């Protein structure tokens, strides 16, 4: 009963804190806002599910993540979108692709270091029964 929602409240606070650390990292500025179809008109022809850190924050606040796993799915989507969309020619292209990997690696490192595995396992199993 009441305890299931304290897990989720605590997960959201943790996720808010991780996302804020990612979003203020200068390396990841390019991921803090949606890709702009006016600037990149062909983006929608490559990427079916856009994702960025400001959307991740909105999703946290709107209770769209019940697990760190679903949260990392969206981090992963940000990275995999950047790798699928951006070619590997220019230095600017390489830079944004490396940044996308570094975003994923940093989120995973933070979560590996700070997240209690039994707290995550509880989250996942509450999500299951529901």
């Amino acid at each position: 009963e009441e305890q299931e929602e304290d897990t989720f409240r605590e997960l959201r606070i943790f996720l808010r804190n991780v996302t804020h650390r990612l979003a203020i990292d200068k390396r990841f500025r390019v991921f803090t806002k949606p890709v702009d179809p006016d600037e990149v008109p062909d983006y929608v022809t490559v990427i079916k599910q856009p994702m960025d850190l400001s959307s991740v924050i909105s999703k946290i606040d709107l209770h769209k993540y019940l697990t760190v796993k679903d949260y990392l799915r969206d981090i992963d989507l940000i990275c995999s979108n950047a790798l699928e969309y951006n070619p590997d020619r220019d230095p600017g292209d390489r830079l944004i692709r490396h940044r996308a990997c570094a975003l994923r690696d940093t989120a995973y490192a933070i979560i590996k270091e700070e997240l209690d595995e039994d707290f995550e396992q509880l989250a996942e199993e509450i999500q299951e029964s529901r």
Partner: peptide
């Protein structure tokens, strides 16, 4: 891949 940004 897409065209690329910039």
């Amino acid at each position: 891949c897409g065209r690329g940004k910039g």
